[PDB]
Design a binder for this molecule. Structure first.
Ligand SMILES: [Mg+2]
Ligand SMILES: [Mg+2]
Ligand SMILES: [Zn+2]
Lengths: 24, 60, 155, 214, 206
RNA sequence: AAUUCUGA
RNA sequence: GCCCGGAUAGCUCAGUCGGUAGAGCAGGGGAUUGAAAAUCCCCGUGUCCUUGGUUCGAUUCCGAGUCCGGGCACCA
RNA sequence: UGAAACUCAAAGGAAUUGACGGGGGCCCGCACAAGCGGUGGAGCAUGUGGUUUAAUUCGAAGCAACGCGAAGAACCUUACCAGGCCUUGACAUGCUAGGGAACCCGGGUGAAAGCCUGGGGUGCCCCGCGAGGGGAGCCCUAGCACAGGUGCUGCAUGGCCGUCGUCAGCUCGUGCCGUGAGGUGUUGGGUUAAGUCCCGCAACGAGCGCAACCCCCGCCGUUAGUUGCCAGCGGUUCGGCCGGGCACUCUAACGGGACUGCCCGCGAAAGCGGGAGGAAGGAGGGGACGACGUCUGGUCAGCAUGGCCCUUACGGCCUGGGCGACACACGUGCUACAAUGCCCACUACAAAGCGAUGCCACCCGGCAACGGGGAGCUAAUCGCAAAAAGGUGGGCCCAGUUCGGAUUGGGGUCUGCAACCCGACCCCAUGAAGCCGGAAUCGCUAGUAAUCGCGGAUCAGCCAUGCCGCGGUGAAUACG
């Protein structure tokens, strides 16, 4: 969910980038 | 703690972290737009008097 | 709504069946205004119809939605210290709204894990006069008539 | 205040009531030299502030009394040894037979250091009547020997308790914000601060004004 | 606690600014602050003239100081000694060319800031405020106008029960834009409180 | 068919 | 002094063939009302007087004591 | 039949204007109904009471206090406590004395503040090359008048803001009626959102109100063309990329048009219903604007200022602690209990704003956060930037789980002198309660409710789930 820091929306709602949302 | 405070708001001693904004009309420390450099009160009172270049009440 | 008699918003004709009602039914299945992920389910049900009865999901609608329309329900009133919940006729307009609603709720009750299955099945049992939505229909009609004692209260 | 100085509290009694406030509050505070510290704060304390229990918010005044009494005597024992008692045995009166005439049934227990005399004739024996007359003399004593611990203690407290308008020892007003000690004459300006336990100073002064006239 | 300033509400159209000059987000702060230090210094040495306005234009590294007044005199002196020592005090802290100017006000009664300072003085000189207002207003409408309005806050006469004497004449639709209404606000400073006065002078239209 | 608000 | 009955939540009372501790009020939290009371939801709450015995183990069944409420203390 | 003692500064009649009514009549607002999603249950974020601590600075208190001051508390901020120091003081003016008069640079002890201590040397008015000092900026020690206070008083005050209330109201001038307070105007009749208007009327006008005049959005045009374009074709390696072109799109400036003007129905009119024409009707949808006034509301802690109080400390500086404290209790919010779902891979459509010791194209290392290089951008021309849900196809298959992510253990990056208190992110492992929530209770009548994402402000970074804007999809019900 929008709080699961290890997924897609996890970072969308967060506003960051990580292993679970590389830079395109 | 107001006058003796702006007398610490003028300089930029040790480190920059302690460099903090401050209104010019008064000693306001909160809600100060680096741009104008004035607090929201002075800012409002001036924008009202007209002493502000190109500022005008929005509307949409 | 004390001045104007409000206004009956218009339903845009369907975009497959062309029914101003086949949409009113999807609208109730629309959570968060996602009409695409809603109409999809509905259309996936119509395929469960044509895949479990040659009957084209059209008469399975004009029938299941007609066998659910409550003729009269109960609308409470209070003359002054009177806990009388008077029974009375239903506006043709209202009827539809009450129907469709009970249809979705009922659908959302069945044990079918998918979705369209539930809508399809509930539509079958309701056309075939035996669906949870009709259970609420008779349940409502029991309250009604059973209180014809308050017939002089048709406000 | 008694939790800052280090003393220990015992809430012997506290009781609510109808709308809002408190009906009766009786507390026991210990620690070395405690009475001497809360003895000056014995009177009626006046308050003047905007009334919260009013619609207009009018400025109102409130009075409340504070009494102080140390914990001295505690035991409860009155063993009247038959050392000061003069028991008499007079002949029974009333019905009976030969035995009421000839047997010294009636008994009179006389309390010599007081003057009170109890008698008994209920039964037909002397040893059960002098013992029944002591179960009565002990009772009437247990009320007239405690009535004096209530009359030696109703003038031992003092006098300042009218609670009326004009009998105040200290005035607390949050309107203009100040505390007025009517004994010494001092006028402190921290009322919301005195309502936290800072009393050492006005107790310092109340123990000079009080024990300065004797 | 309603009503909003009638100036910042007319700025757009009706009433013009009082300091127009584009600027970049890196100077505006320092420059805008300059204008204030100017209205601050012009505040003191000039009150004897009736500084009913101070328009300041600036193209770059210059200044268009224009002090409108209804009675110049003391502004210059009698040739060019004061207005000269003012450009002196000015540039004595302003790195630009203080291009000063001075307008005149024909009808000083139809200028709010003026009528404001006016009454603001009749107050400090212990006058029947109940009168001074009905008299200052009985000055405008006669000396040509369509609406007039003055307001004085609590402490009139010194009574602790702070009042607020109203008093207006003519017409004063603060809601109607096409009208142009002069607004003023002076501050009497007495021994007790610190009164406040507002001036509302109605003028043109279209 | 549902009580009360002291005293600047 | 003899005979009979009792004490159990802070208050007033029920209860078990011995193994389960209960009711109303009070008290605490929340809710309503501007705020009180009334009303509504949510809970907790005990060496079953002390001292012994039988029993596998007792609030209950016997022994002792302390207090309480009654009835008895007549013939001379 | 019928007193007194004592006691009070009134008890009382009628008649105004109001307020109130569990009185009546007519007519409104998401006020109820109608209808959808939420709170109160769980975990957590934030604010508050309480409690505790040496201090947990302060205020705000029903609606109209509580994600409110606070639109950026690690020292700073900072106003609180513990501790170290400074007192002509950090600042404004001015006076007096010999120093000293722009001035820049070390050492020492201490945690730092501060105290001590070591040097170049001061243009200048200028008798005067000069010994000297008059000397103006002006720094240092001593002295005086003073400076300082976020200490109190928001029922001493200004100014500003909240609420009744976006309510339909409130007044004045003259006349008349009433002894007067006061009413009539401002009632009744009809209409409208409206004291808007129409008709009568001892009234006639007028003022503050609403409206309109202001901006945004929709339809159209004129002028404008480095945004846009095979609408036309050209070459086009194929990206409007080229030249070339203003017809579109758009950008911003000035105008038109809607007004119940036209038909018909009703009415005396005002006005209402419906129909057409029109992109648009009977205030088309939003703003901005919020009357005489109420609340001794709040705000001396934004500023100012009356008055009281301290002035080698109630002032000034400093390292550090505290505002973040938790057995409890209330409010606003975030993430959830799931299949109209979650996770995984691939591909598309916006708008509004914002960027030089600033936003960062693209490579290389590291799974990553992040680090090197470096180009472009003063920005309708480059970047922040991928929008997300969705469309799409592959696996989970109903178990507290591939749901949900609290807590805890280990490892790192980045600002910042410095992350124990007390920061934000990265990876691994931990996977607690929650299965739609008692009594009660919140918002909304349309592109609204719901859902989804983007930007800005403050700011080194950020506890921002808060606030102000922007856009994608897009409902149900209203009898009364
Ligand atoms: Mg009572
Ligand atoms: Mg509405
Ligand atoms: Zn300010």
């Amino acid at each position: 969910g929008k709080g699961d820091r290890r997924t897609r929306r996890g970072k969308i709602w967060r506003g960051t980038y990580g292993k679970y949302r590389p830079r395109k | 703690a107001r006058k003796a405070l702006i007398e610490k708001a003028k300089r930029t001693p040790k480190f920059k972290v302690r460099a903090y904004t401050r209104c010019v009309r008064c000693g306001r420390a909160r809600s100060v737009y680096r741009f104008f450099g004035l607090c929201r009160i002075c800012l409002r009172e001036l924008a009202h008097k007209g002493q502000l270049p190109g500022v005008r009440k929005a509307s949409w | 709504a004390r001045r104007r008699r409000a206004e009956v918003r218009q339903l845009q004709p369907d975009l497959v069946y062309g029914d101003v009602l086949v949409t009113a039914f999807i609208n109730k299945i629309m959570r968060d205004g996602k009409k695409n992920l809603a109409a999809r389910i509905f259309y996936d049900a119509c395929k469960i119809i044509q895949e479990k009865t040659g009957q084209e999901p059209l008469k399975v609608f004009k029938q299941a939605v007609e066998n659910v329309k409550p003729r009269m329900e109960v609308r409470s009133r209070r003359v002054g210290g009177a806990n009388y919940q008077v029974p009375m006729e239903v506006s043709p307009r209202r009827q539809q709204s009450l129907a469709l609603r009970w249809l979705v709720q009922a659908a959302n009750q069945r044990p079918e894990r998918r979705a369209a299955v539930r809508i399809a099945h509930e539509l079958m049992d309701a056309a075939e006069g035996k669906g949870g939505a009709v259970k609420k229909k008779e349940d409502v009609e029991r309250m009604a008539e059973a209180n014809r004692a308050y017939a002089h209260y048709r406000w | 205040f008694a939790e800052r100085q280090g003393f220990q509290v015992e809430v012997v009694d506290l009781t609510p009531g109808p709308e809002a406030g408190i009906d009766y509050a009786q507390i026991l505070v210990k620690g070395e030299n405690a009475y001497g510290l809360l003895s000056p704060e014995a009177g009626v304390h006046r308050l003047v502030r905007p009334s919260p229990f009013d619609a207009s918010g009018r400025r109102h005044t409130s009075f409340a009394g504070v009494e102080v009494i140390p914990e001295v005597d505690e035991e409860v024992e009155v063993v009247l040894k038959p050392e000061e008692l003069r028991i008499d045995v007079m002949r029974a009166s009333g019905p009976g037979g030969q035995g009421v005439n000839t047997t010294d049934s009636a008994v009179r227990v006389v309390h010599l250091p007081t003057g009170i005399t109890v008698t008994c004739q209920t039964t037909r024996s002397q040893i059960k009547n002098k013992e029944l007359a002591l179960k009565i003399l002990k009772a009437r004593l247990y009320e007239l020997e405690r009535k004096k611990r209530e009359e030696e203690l109703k003038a031992l407290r003092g006098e300042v308790r009218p609670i009326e308008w004009g009998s105040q020892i200290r005035s607390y007003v949050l309107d203009k914000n100040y505390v007025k000690d009517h004994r010494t004459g001092l006028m402190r300006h921290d009322p919301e601060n005195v309502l936290d336990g800072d009393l050492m100073d006005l107790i310092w002064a109340g123990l000079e004004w009080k024990a300065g006239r004797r | 606690g309603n009503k909003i300033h009638p100036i910042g509400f007319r700025l757009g159209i009706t009433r013009d600014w009082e300091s127009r000059w584009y600027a970049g987000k890196k100077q505006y702060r320092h420059l805008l602050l300059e204008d204030q230090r100017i209205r601050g210094l012009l505040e003191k040495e000039l009150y004897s003239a009736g500084l009913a306005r101070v328009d300041i234009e600036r193209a770059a590294d210059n200044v268009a100081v224009t002090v409108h007044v209804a009675k110049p005199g003391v502004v210059i002196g009698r040739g060019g000694e004061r207005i000269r020592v003012l450009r002196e005090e000015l540039a004595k802290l302003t790195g630009k060319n203080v291009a000063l100017n001075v307008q005149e006000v024909q009808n000083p009664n139809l200028s709010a800031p003026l009528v404001a300072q006016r009454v603001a003085e009749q107050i400090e000189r212990r006058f029947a405020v109940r009168r001074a207002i009905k008299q200052a207003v009985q000055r405008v409408m006669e000396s040509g106008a369509k609406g007039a309005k003055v307001i004085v806050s609590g402490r009139i006469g010194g009574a602790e029960q702070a009042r607020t004497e109203w008093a207006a004449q003519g017409r004063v639709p603060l809601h109607t834009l096409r009208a142009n209404i002069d607004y003023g606000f002076a501050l009497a400073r007495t021994t007790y409180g610190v009164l406040g006065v507002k001036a509302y002078i109605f003028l043109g239209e279209v």
